[PDB]
Amino acid sequence: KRELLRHRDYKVDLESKLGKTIVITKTTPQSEMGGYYCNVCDCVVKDSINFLDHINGKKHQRNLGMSMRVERSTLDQVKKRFEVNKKKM
RNA sequence: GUGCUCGCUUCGGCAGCACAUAUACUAAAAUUGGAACGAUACAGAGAAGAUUAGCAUGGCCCCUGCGCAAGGAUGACA
Incomplete structure (x- = not known):
């Protein structure tokens, strides 16, 4: 049971x-x-x-209970993302 | 399926007849694993003897002293 890979919502403190x-x-x-x-x-x-x-590697994501599979988004998700940014600005 | 039987039988049909004779790593999909001498990080003289200073021992030749053994020549009247 491995969840799908999720995009990191936080910036990395490399600098x-x-x-x-x-x-x-x-x-x-x-x-x-x-x-x-x-x-x-x-x-x-x-x-x-x-x-x-490393943080984009198979082992790091495995330790987080993830996998190398990305969610297939649909039409309404993309459209609502457009409307969400339209509202935000 | 095609065509044919002097068949039943009607052109609506039926029974039989000739030819057709045995494909496929078979696979579209299932999943979780183990993984560089590639980068950065470290080191980097990435090929030398792995040494030289005295004294004593050992070899040869004298000189001196002591001991052992065997000897040579010489000296001394009252």
């Missing part, structure tokens, strides 16, 4: 820690280590684009 230096000792955990950390995956990745590859 958040530019210039912010991290002093790394032996006792420091992977959470505060340099780079990007998948709290769901418990893995460290040291690129923004490689972290994006």
